[PDB]
Design a protein around this ligand. Sequence first.
Ligand SMILES: N[C@@H](Cn1cc(F)c(=O)[nH]c1=O)C(=O)O
Ligand SMILES: N[C@@H](Cn1cc(F)c(=O)[nH]c1=O)C(=O)O
Lengths: 260, 260
Amino acid sequence: NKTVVVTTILESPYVMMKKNHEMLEGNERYEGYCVDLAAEIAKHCGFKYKLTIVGDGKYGARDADTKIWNGMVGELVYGKADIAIAPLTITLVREEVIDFSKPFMSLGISIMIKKGTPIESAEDLSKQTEIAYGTLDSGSTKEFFRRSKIAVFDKMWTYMRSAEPSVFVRTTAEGVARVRKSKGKYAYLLESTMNEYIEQRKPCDTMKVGGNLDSKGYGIATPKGSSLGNAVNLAVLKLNEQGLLDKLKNKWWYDKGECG
Amino acid sequence: NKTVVVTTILESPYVMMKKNHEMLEGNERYEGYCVDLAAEIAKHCGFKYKLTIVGDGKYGARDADTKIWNGMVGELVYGKADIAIAPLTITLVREEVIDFSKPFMSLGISIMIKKGTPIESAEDLSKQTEIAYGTLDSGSTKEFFRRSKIAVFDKMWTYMRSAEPSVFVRTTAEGVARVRKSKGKYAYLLESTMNEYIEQRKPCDTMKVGGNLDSKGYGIATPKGSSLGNAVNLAVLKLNEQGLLDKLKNKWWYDKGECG
Ligand SMILES: N[C@@H](Cn1cc(F)c(=O)[nH]c1=O)C(=O)O
Ligand SMILES: N[C@@H](Cn1cc(F)c(=O)[nH]c1=O)C(=O)O
């Protein structure tokens, strides 16, 4: 057997650099939900692995011109990594080029506001212009709006794509910082999982409002045809049935929440 | 190509006999969420199909002695059906013998009470003996309790397995009838999806209480190695992304709710 190369992404609380990572090496440098999940998956599948952070820091999109896949999806497609264990959304376009395990976490697009912002829904956002709003500049959330045929979401996309200055951000942390520093004049559309995590982090000035706009899941990905796919899929189901996934979410989201 | 034999189960509001089914034939005899889903899946995969109701009316379990699979899972395993489109829970033991598409619906085990019953959680149920409680006599809900290592659920299982008279029911309708006629002395543990549906049906005397005990999903199943598996999986993802699955749930659960 050969050491399995795992690609993942620095996104809290899935994968984060330990405070004393400098005095550590290898897999011990990282911590988080996906770090713990990788260990469990490897144990149940019987393989040794090496955690690596995706080179370009992206999730995975295909350039329409070059037809090249970037991010974690690209690392799997081109053979740079053997498996991706991260908050990677299971989508049709990705499923066509890589394999996904059954979902290990459920989520949906949601709204994050600075406390006090007079917004309760996506409809509210679409009907006004005072408060700007956007999404991560790349990823399944942005694609949801770009492709949506639903009236409200179509209206939101039409506004966001031409908004000036840009309402799109490079990372979740940037979106959160923008919400926190815009005095309620910026609302952020992001995956509910990240939203829920941030709501329990100091300075406790943000909140998730309304229901989710959609429902989907994160899955563990492997190059299509990979001999690891079957075992990884069964391991995810086993971990869910044993309640381990629920335990891990509580560990990284709520057990040490900072907002009471 | 050959007509695809679809196996499903009579479970409201997934598959139900039309009021005037007697004057109809073939697939037109049935209606419901899964009937509509089957039509969408068939359209997107390009196949003609025949809806059939599982012979033994079961979901799918393996007899420990004969090693024989019953229910819809069995029909796929033994080649009696080509695909199962129903509220079939994706589980490890089943995934080992048949293939499952990514989930088309999310759910979790939940508690159904007759309005007014002094119960708010699974913990509440486990700490008392006045109110009896049980599950469907076979299926993923019962297995959840039988296998759970979680204190509260283990305590509940220990009670349910030896309770007299039996707290297990043959069908969802039986569990609901038992809740409605037991004057609050019987609480029913069932999948949240069914619970949510019943709560919006007359006589509007039941209610879902507390959060779900777990989180999982329903998937479309095919015999392992089936040439239909890949297309069906992509179709589920496409239908979810296009918002069709959400539309179908609203259609069969809430659009015509009978409880205001
Ligand atoms: N999980 C997404 C990436 N991703 C992450 C986020 F935190 C978010 O808010 N939106 C998003 O699309 C993907 O796989 O593209
Ligand atoms: N979906 C389950 C069957 N099933 C159905 C129910 F309505 C319920 O409450 N519990 C259950 O296990 C399976 O696939 O076994």
